[model samples]
Target: MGDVVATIKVMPESPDVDLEALKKEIQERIPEGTELHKIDEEPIAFGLVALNVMVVVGDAEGGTEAAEESLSGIEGVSNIEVTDVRRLM
Candidate 1:
């Protein structure tokens, strides 16, 4: 088994969405053996913010899929895009 690091961008449905709470919920929903490395805020149009999250999983294969599936079900999540995926040493 190998580690896979994925960077995902999460866009909220509206600017009023509670980002901190959403982050917490996303953390809870991530797949087992996946670790959250960090979350950064990026400014979008109309005062809305996008969250860029760095996640690491123990197994490379299917790791990104699992994470994407988990993130898709969270409330307040307008859209999710997998920015990057790379194998960890």
Candidate 2:
């Protein structure tokens, strides 16, 4: 088929979570054949910060779900919401 691009929002377990460390961990844990396109820090409220990440991977069965699961396994990551997905030309 083609490549699938997915954008997801990840929230930390608490405001005290070290986002820098978490980001590095996530980068290291991402699945093979998947590329981390972008990662931005979104301030919610108080000290809470949310990570908006965009990734590109092969268009395969359960690709997005597997990507979400990989990131969710990272420590300090509380939740993951898949905001967007599209097939790349």
Candidate 3:
């Protein structure tokens, strides 16, 4: 099982932030074999005005590194905060 411990909004780069497209892209980025436990989108007050996207991924051992790497490749994703990792407990 997976649980979303916390989340922080990911702000966009200067000039523009396509929230709709970014939401879709983020949703689509979820890999196969791992289940999406929860996802929540919220607003943040500062840093380019982004949405705090909280997502919990279950059965995500093998794909975690790859997923994180892929997210880095995406232009708009400046940072990702992994609030909680169960560590096989």
Candidate 4:
């Protein structure tokens, strides 16, 4: 099967962030059979505030539905950006 790649970026609901809780929430929502390729993060807008995250979804085709559900269901997620998707050979 050809697996597509996708990235999802999000902002917190509150100005103050609770990274531990957020991480747990994300981990819990991962699809049953898909793999988490990688997770990287940085400060957004020149490290002044907010977080810029890159989540490499290895099997986007299989995990797209679950991932979307996870992010949307995640409490305190203010905004999200899913982009830079491509197919995996």
Candidate 5:
């Protein structure tokens, strides 16, 4: 069986955020049985930016629902949303 890739968007409380540290925190926050793929960013215009993080987890019927809440626990984070998911070969 193949694994799955999940892309999630994490928004900071403010633009004063340093994505580097958040990236590190994200690494620590994710639950067991999941692996981090990479971290990216997106421009929301008006000097707004957010994190686009992709994580790898085992293929399951529920998906990364647990990881979603895991990311939301980061202190500097405002919120999080799951954007994309695909089966990984």
Candidate 6:
């Protein structure tokens, strides 16, 4: 069972996009098989409050693709970029 961690950068729909509420959606939508390692708030420059949604994706990276699509399909989410995918298992 080979698993890995990913930092799927998530930008909310708005600056005040209810980040507290946003986490709830991630927890709900992100599959139970994919363990949510952590979600960090990254307040970068230019008034941008962003998210670094890190998760331990399912075995063999098969579920990572599903996570990517599902994350984009969520209602309140905005842009997404895949920055780091480390094979940790």
lDDT of 3 by residue, 24-59 (tens): 765655443254434445444353455555445543
* Model 1 lDDT tens row, 1-89: 36666676666777675678668766775654457767778766588776777776664445445665665565544575566556676
Structural similarity to truth (TM-score) of each candidate: 0.67, 0.63, 0.52, 0.57, 0.66, 0.67
lDDT of 5: 0.64
**How would the candidate models be sorted by lDDT, starting from the highest?**
1, 2, 6, 5, 4, 3
CA lDDT of every candidate: 0.65, 0.64, 0.49, 0.51, 0.64, 0.64
Q: Which runs of model 2 end up more than 4 angstroms from their true locations?
A: 1-3, 58-65, 71-77, 86-89
lDDT of 5 by residue, 1-89 (tens): 47677776666667766677667766766544556777678755366566777876764345445675665555544465566666677
**Which whole-number lDDT from 0 to 100 does residue 53 have in model 3?**
52
Clashes of 2: 0
TM-score of 2: 0.63
TM-score between candidate 3 and the true structure: 0.52
Over 1-89, each residue of candidate 6 has an lDDT whose tens digit, in order, gives: 36567776566656665667767776765644567777878765366566677887655445545665765666544565556566776
lDDT of 2 by residue, 34-77 (tens): 57777778876577786767777664455445565665555544
Worst 10 residues of 6 by lDDT: 57-66
Any runs in candidate 5 off by more than 4 Å, and if so which? 58-66, 69-72
Candidate achieving the largest lDDT: 1
| Candidate 1 accuracy as lDDT | 0.65
* Residue 83 in candidate 4, Cα distance off native in Å: 2.9
Query: Over 4 Å off in model 3, which ranges?
Result: 1-8, 31-33, 37-47, 76-89
Q: Could you tell me which residue pairs clash in candidate 5?
A: none
